[PDB]
Each structure stands twice: as C-alpha cells, then as structure tokens.
Write an enzyme that holds these catalytic residues in place. Structure first.
Site, PDB file in Angstrom:
ATOM      1  N   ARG A   1      -0.945   2.583  -5.663  1.00  0.00           N
ATOM      2  CA  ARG A   1      -1.422   3.678  -4.837  1.00  0.00           C
ATOM      3  C   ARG A   1      -0.171   4.520  -4.510  1.00  0.00           C
ATOM      4  O   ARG A   1       0.950   3.997  -4.485  1.00  0.00           O
ATOM      5  CB  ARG A   1      -2.053   3.152  -3.536  1.00  0.00           C
ATOM      6  CG  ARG A   1      -1.460   3.806  -2.292  1.00  0.00           C
ATOM      7  CD  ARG A   1      -2.438   4.191  -1.211  1.00  0.00           C
ATOM      8  NE  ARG A   1      -2.793   3.084  -0.346  1.00  0.00           N
ATOM      9  CZ  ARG A   1      -3.016   3.178   0.964  1.00  0.00           C
ATOM     10  NH1 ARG A   1      -2.916   4.328   1.609  1.00  0.00           N
ATOM     11  NH2 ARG A   1      -3.390   2.103   1.628  1.00  0.00           N
TER      12      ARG A   1
ATOM     13  N   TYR B   1     -10.715  -1.475   0.013  1.00  0.00           N
ATOM     14  CA  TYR B   1      -9.929  -2.471  -0.739  1.00  0.00           C
ATOM     15  C   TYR B   1     -10.826  -3.390  -1.566  1.00  0.00           C
ATOM     16  O   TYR B   1     -11.988  -3.630  -1.201  1.00  0.00           O
ATOM     17  CB  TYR B   1      -9.043  -3.313   0.196  1.00  0.00           C
ATOM     18  CG  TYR B   1      -7.849  -2.582   0.795  1.00  0.00           C
ATOM     19  CD1 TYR B   1      -7.936  -1.233   1.158  1.00  0.00           C
ATOM     20  CD2 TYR B   1      -6.638  -3.243   1.025  1.00  0.00           C
ATOM     21  CE1 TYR B   1      -6.854  -0.561   1.731  1.00  0.00           C
ATOM     22  CE2 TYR B   1      -5.547  -2.578   1.596  1.00  0.00           C
ATOM     23  CZ  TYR B   1      -5.667  -1.239   1.946  1.00  0.00           C
ATOM     24  OH  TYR B   1      -4.603  -0.569   2.505  1.00  0.00           O
TER      25      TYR B   1
ATOM     26  N   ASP C   1      -5.200  -2.871  11.721  1.00  0.00           N
ATOM     27  CA  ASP C   1      -4.091  -3.458  10.972  1.00  0.00           C
ATOM     28  C   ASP C   1      -3.176  -4.066  12.043  1.00  0.00           C
ATOM     29  O   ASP C   1      -3.255  -3.692  13.231  1.00  0.00           O
ATOM     30  CB  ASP C   1      -3.294  -2.398  10.200  1.00  0.00           C
ATOM     31  CG  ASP C   1      -3.991  -1.930   8.934  1.00  0.00           C
ATOM     32  OD1 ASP C   1      -4.957  -2.585   8.478  1.00  0.00           O
ATOM     33  OD2 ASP C   1      -3.555  -0.892   8.380  1.00  0.00           O
TER      34      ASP C   1
ATOM     35  N   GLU D   1       0.912   0.059  -2.412  1.00  0.00           N
ATOM     36  CA  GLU D   1       0.251  -1.190  -2.765  1.00  0.00           C
ATOM     37  C   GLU D   1       0.000  -1.121  -4.267  1.00  0.00           C
ATOM     38  O   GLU D   1      -0.446  -0.088  -4.793  1.00  0.00           O
ATOM     39  CB  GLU D   1      -1.072  -1.315  -2.011  1.00  0.00           C
ATOM     40  CG  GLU D   1      -0.903  -1.362  -0.501  1.00  0.00           C
ATOM     41  CD  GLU D   1      -2.159  -0.934   0.244  1.00  0.00           C
ATOM     42  OE1 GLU D   1      -2.876  -0.017  -0.231  1.00  0.00           O
ATOM     43  OE2 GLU D   1      -2.411  -1.499   1.322  1.00  0.00           O
TER      44      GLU D   1
END
Length: 679
Positions: free
Chosen positions: A531, A633, A238, A515
C-alpha cells in the site's frame, strides 16, 4: 387492534421507484394505528439506489413529508429506521452500517431483518441476519399511532407528498407485521435464516472481545489451516487501546474452527465484552493506559514445520502515533539489551537493562539488581513475582473511566504501574509453536535492530514468506514498515527463525503506512506488493533473497484510495491457464474502503535477467459484492482442496461512521472456476 399477525405478504416484486401498496390488506387499518409491534421481512435488493425503504407507514399528503415510519437499507449495507412526525414533535432514528449484503458468489441474495418496537420497555431494536444490531431507548415511547394523518402502508418506498421516496428495487420475500413485541431470541432465530460465509472469531467466544480486526490466514504443509486476528476490546480503534491477538485452527479444510486462544496478550487491563458507544462523541474515545498487541503475521517453516506468530507490541498507552523515537535498547559490552526506567527516577532516565537470563542491571554500577524478568517479561524481586492491580474500564456518560480493581496480575515491564518500565516506543514480538498452537514458546522481542532514529517499526499484517528455491531457499521473511530512514522494510532469518536481520527497502522518511505482502517467483526471486500514500498499489522486486529491493513501480489497473488499504497477495500451488499464478485481494474503490475484489495474476517470463525477468498479467478480477459494500483488510489462503479461503473485514474501517461494529470479520471460500468467471 387484534393480538398477533396484523398483516402478511409473500413474494412481492417491486419495480424500482414504483413501491407497492398494502392499503387494501384486511389489516391495513390496524397497521396504520400500531402503538407498538414487530416487523420482520425477507428481501432481495436489485437496485443501487442509495437509500431503499423496505416497509413504511405514514402521511403521504402535501407538507407532511416528515410524518412517517420506515425501515430502510442502503446500497452500502446499512440498515435503519426513522420514526417521524416532524422534528418539533419527534424524530427517532436508529441504524447500523454494514449490517446486510447484496450479492454473494455472483447472485443477489435474500437478507432477513426485523424491527421490534417494545412499548413495555420503551425500546426499539433492529436485527439482521441473526444479529441484534442496535438498540434505542426513549422515555417518550412513540410509534405509528403517534404519527399525524397516516394514510398509507407501503412496501419498497416511503410516500412523501405523493411521491415514492427512498425507492427500493427487488423482491420482498415475506413480511410479517405483529402487534406484539416478539422476544430478541425469536427475532435472532427468525432473521438468522439467511447467513453467508462464516465467522472464526465472534463476539461471545472465549476471547471475551466484542470486536475483531486485521485478519491472518494460512494453510500449513500438514493441511491444517490456521488463523489469527486482533481481538479489539475497546471498540475497533488502532493501538493506544486494549488489544490481544487471537488464534484458531481448522483441521477439516476450513469448515469448522477450534475454540480460540490468545497467544499474545497483556493482563494490565481486563479482557471483557463491552459495547463501545457509536455516538458522535463516545466513538472517538479510546483506552488510554493499556498495553497491547496489534497486527498479526503468521508464518510456517516448511522444513521444521514450526509456525511463528508476530505482532506489534505496544507498551501501556502507546500506539504508533505516540511512540517515542528510539530503539528501546541500550548497548552495553557491545550487546543490545532492553532499557528500563526505575519508576522513582526522572521521566526519561533509563538507567537499567535486562541482560542474560532476564537479570536486570544497574548500568551505572554495572551490577545486577535484586530484580529479574522471566520469559514473559513479568517482574520478580528475590524470586517472588511482583504484581499490580488490574484495571477495568467503563463509560460514565461520554467519559471513559479507567479504574483499578482488586484483581492482582503479574507486574509486566510494559505496564503503566510497573516498578521498572520499558522505553515507550513500539516493539516487535513473536512466539513459535511446534504443535500447531497447542503450546507457544516464551516471548521473543526481536526488535533489537529497531533504528534509533525511527519513531516506529511495525509489521505488515497478514503472512510471512519462506523462499522455496534458489540460493536463499529456506530463508524466512516478514514484511515491515516504519517512520525512519526507510518506510518499507523486512526482517529475515536464515536459521529457521532463531535470529532475525532487518533490511531497509527504500530511503523514504515520510512514515506512510506501507503495509505489504510477499510472493515468490518461479526461480525464487521475490515480488512485494504494498500500500502507498499515492493512488496506487506499488510493486518492488528482489533478486537477492530480500536483501535489496528495486524502486517502487505502480501496479497498473488496480484502483485504490489515496490513503490506501492493506492488501493480501499469495502464491497459488497450481498453474491457472497453464501459468504460475498469484492471487490478490483489496478494496477497489477510489474513495472509501469498499468494492472488494480478488484478482488473479499470471506470471510471465520475459527472459530478461534480474528485476525485469518476470511480468504479471492481472487477467481476472472477481467482485465479492456490490460496489458500495464495505471491504477493508484481508488475507487469502489456498485451502487443502483447490479453494481460496478469504478472511476479511466486510466494512469500511476508514470511515468514522463505521467504528465499533461487531461481526464484520468474515470467512469465505472460492474456487478457481468462480474466480476466473468460469463459475
């Protein structure tokens, strides 16, 4: 030993734990002595046993349990080999997680794998389903001829002290054992015979990135299907890395995709295909001084047909974890402007602002400087574009060297070597397009509203939502989350994307990764699924076009992990079982991002008013593969035909053992018949 095929067997059904002896094959004597060679096999696993040997050659006698060679797969899609003759002599291993799969569209499927032991190049290489998975180089090249006391050639297990270890269950479609090392090209073609689903972005395409993550998929009102994803250059880490946002579209219902573009990208660091180390040390290393874009959101304004692309904008060396608390803006004459620091001033002296027409001002004197910024936020001094040297990055052992090159790139305010630097917090950027991605507007930083008390305010990746009915019909919404006075948040626009308003959806200050994605109810009210840091997906409802939201309520029956994973939930245009329906995608395991499932929720009207008016019955669940198969994801989309497209990460993006994997972003399509178990 002869040149060529030493042995070949076809259609062998192996009962779990029994194995299959290849010792009476004419060429077993040769296989038991190979100095190098190639093994290629097609198989179908029907077992959930953790580790399953496909083929092995070794010593089955007492006390010699560590003397063998085998190619194996795991119930989680991993694949590898172990070449052993006891640890003091040699223990060569090579593997790559999420390389194969078990089930596709309700049925167990065949996978084709290959191992090449190349003596000439002192190298071992593993292939699966048309992909070169991993390479192992060894000065002291070894193979079967180096194993002491080899006494067996076995299919579906490895003989250890007379027992069948790593028991496989299923079918060996075919297995060919060559004494010679075939070319990578032959093996790519050989194993590429079995592939499932398709790729949109891939290592080797024009994006120049070896890795991708964070899917966004959306079918436009015109029938065109568009997609976006993080093009992660420095492995799959990330932000605080080099990442651009890639884009592609399909004009044939999701069958083929256009050459990818990079609508949101930075050039301070070169975009190049690089193999990020996966060893215990190097895997943790990430690019330190690069600016990046991360987490895309796609959205269409059905009235104007305009599409928008949003993503987090991270200044050089910044990620959410090290973002500075603040807005990154300064208010002058009652208006917020982006703050800038002159590189020769104190480390935290942001004494300049980018005002109207990109003119940079000296706030102290309130006078313009000789500098300005264009629509790309690149710097100019007296009408001449400033430039800085682009960086390159390479590993020198376990160290990642970030060094300047001779290449000149336009000096951007978000670059480490800019003469005017932006405040080191995260920003929200966006561009629009009126021609489905053929061209995009200038860079629009919409985060002027970022709370000054917030560390970060970022997007919930996936897609946005436009209200189609009721008092707020036309309003555009994009889900957000932050470490601020609120966790979950949203930004909406009532003027077709020209201006955005920030909304705090709760009063949580923990900064968990909330998210979320948004779906619309029949009357125009909204339900957002998100989430959480608990062991559940939460649901919140809005009855005023997203301005206020109810308290989080757990989504009963859909399991998840404590840390959670991003989810995708979308509206479906036609009723299912005669009721309005929404579709959700998310890994379903309680630990690890795996066992992805697509659920169909039917909307019911209780007739109650407000928040409690609608109830969703999660009536169907559809398992994409077997329980241990990775799934992180994702983003669903209703395609022009009746199908539901799915762009997702087929691996465990949480696992520190599955970092930097190529070819994990897959595109698949399912009919409602399949999804509802109707088939």
């Amino acid at each position: 030993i002869p040149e060529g095929i030493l042995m070949e067997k076809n259609n062998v059904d192996i009962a779990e734990g029994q194995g299959y002896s290849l010792d009476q094959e004419a060429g077993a004597k040769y296989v038991k002595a190979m100095t190098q060679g190639t093994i290629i096999l097609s198989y179908k696993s029907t077992s959930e046993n953790g580790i399953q040997s496909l083929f092995s050659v070794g010593n089955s006698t007492a006390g010699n349990q560590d003397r063998h060679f085998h190619i194996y797969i795991t119930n989680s899609g991993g694949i590898g080999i172990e070449l052993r003759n006891t640890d003091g002599v040699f223990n060569y291993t090579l593997d790559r997680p999420a390389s194969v799969r078990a089930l596709y569209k309700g049925e167990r499927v065949f996978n084709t794998v290959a191992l090449k032991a190349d003596a000439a190049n002192k190298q071992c290489r593993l292939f699966a389903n048309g992909e070169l998975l991993a390479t192992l180089d060894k000065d002291a090249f070894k193979f079967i001829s180096d194993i002491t006391g080899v006494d067996n050639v076995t299919l579906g297990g490895t003989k250890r002290q007379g027992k069948i270890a790593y028991p496989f269950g299923g079918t060996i479609g075919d297995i060919k054992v060559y004494s010679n090392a075939l070319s990578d090209e032959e093996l790519i073609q050989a194993t590429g015979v079995t592939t499932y689903g398709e790729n949109i972005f891939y290592a080797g395409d024009v994006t120049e990135s070896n890795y991708f993550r964070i899917p966004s998929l959306l079918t436009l009102s015109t029938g065109t299907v568009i997609s976006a994803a993080d093009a992660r250059y420095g492995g799959t880490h990330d932000s605080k890395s080099k990442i651009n946002i890639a884009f592609a579209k399909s004009t044939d219902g999701g069958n083929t995709w256009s050459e990818p573009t990079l609508p949101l990208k930075f050039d301070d660091y070169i975009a190049k295909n690089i193999d990020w180390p996966r060893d215990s040390v190097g895997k943790n290393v990430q690019i330190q001084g690069s600016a990046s874009y991360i987490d895309p959101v796609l959205l269409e304004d059905k009235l104007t047909k305009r599409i928008f692309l949003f993503a987090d904008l991270m200044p050089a060396g910044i990620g959410s974890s090290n973002a500075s608390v603040g807005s990154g803006f300064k208010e002058v004459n009652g208006k917020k402007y982006l703050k800038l620091r002159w590189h020769k001033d104190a480390g935290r002296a942001y004494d300049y602002t980018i005002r109207e027409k990109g003119v940079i001002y000296n706030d102290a004197t309130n006078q313009p400087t000789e500098f300005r910024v264009d629509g790309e936020y690149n710097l100019y001094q007296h009408d001449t574009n400033l430039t800085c040297k682009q960086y390159d990055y390479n590993f020198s052992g376990n160290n990642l060297i970030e060094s300047k090159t001779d290449v000149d790139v336009n000096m951007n305010i978000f670059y480490k070597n800019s003469v005017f630097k932006a405040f080191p917090t995260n920003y929200l950027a966006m561009r629009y397009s009126d021609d489905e991605g053929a061209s995009w507007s200038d860079l629009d930083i919409v985060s002027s509203f970022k709370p000054e008390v917030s560390k970060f305010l970022v997007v919930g990746p996936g897609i946005g939502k436009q209200i189609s009915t009721g008092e707020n019909a036309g309003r555009l919404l994009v889900p957000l989350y932050s470490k601020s006075s609120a966790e979950l948040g949203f930004m909406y626009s009532d003027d077709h994307g020209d201006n955005w308003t920030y909304v705090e959806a709760d009063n949580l200050t923990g900064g968990a990764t909330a998210e979320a994605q948004i779906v619309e109810m029949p009357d125009g009210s909204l339900k957002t699924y998100l989430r959480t840091g608990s062991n559940c997906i939460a649901e919140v409802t809005s009855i005023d076009g997203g301005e206020t939201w109810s308290d989080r309520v757990p989504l009963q029956g859909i399991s998840t992990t404590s840390y959670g994973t991003q989810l995708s939930v979308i509206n479906y245009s036609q009723p299912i079982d005669g009721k309005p329906a929404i579709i959700l995608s998310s890994p379903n395991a309680t630990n690890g991002r795996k066992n992805g499932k697509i659920w169909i929720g039917l909307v019911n009207d209780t007739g109650n008013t407000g928040i409690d008016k609608y109830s969703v019955e999660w009536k169907y669940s559809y398992a994409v593969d077997t329980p241990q198969m990775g799934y992180s994801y994702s983003c669903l989309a209703e395609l022009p035909d009746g199908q539901v497209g799915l762009l997702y990460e087929k691996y465990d993006s949480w696992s520190r053992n599955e970092l930097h994997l190529k070819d994990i972003l897959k595109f698949e399509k399912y009919s409602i018949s399949e999804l509802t178990g109707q088939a």
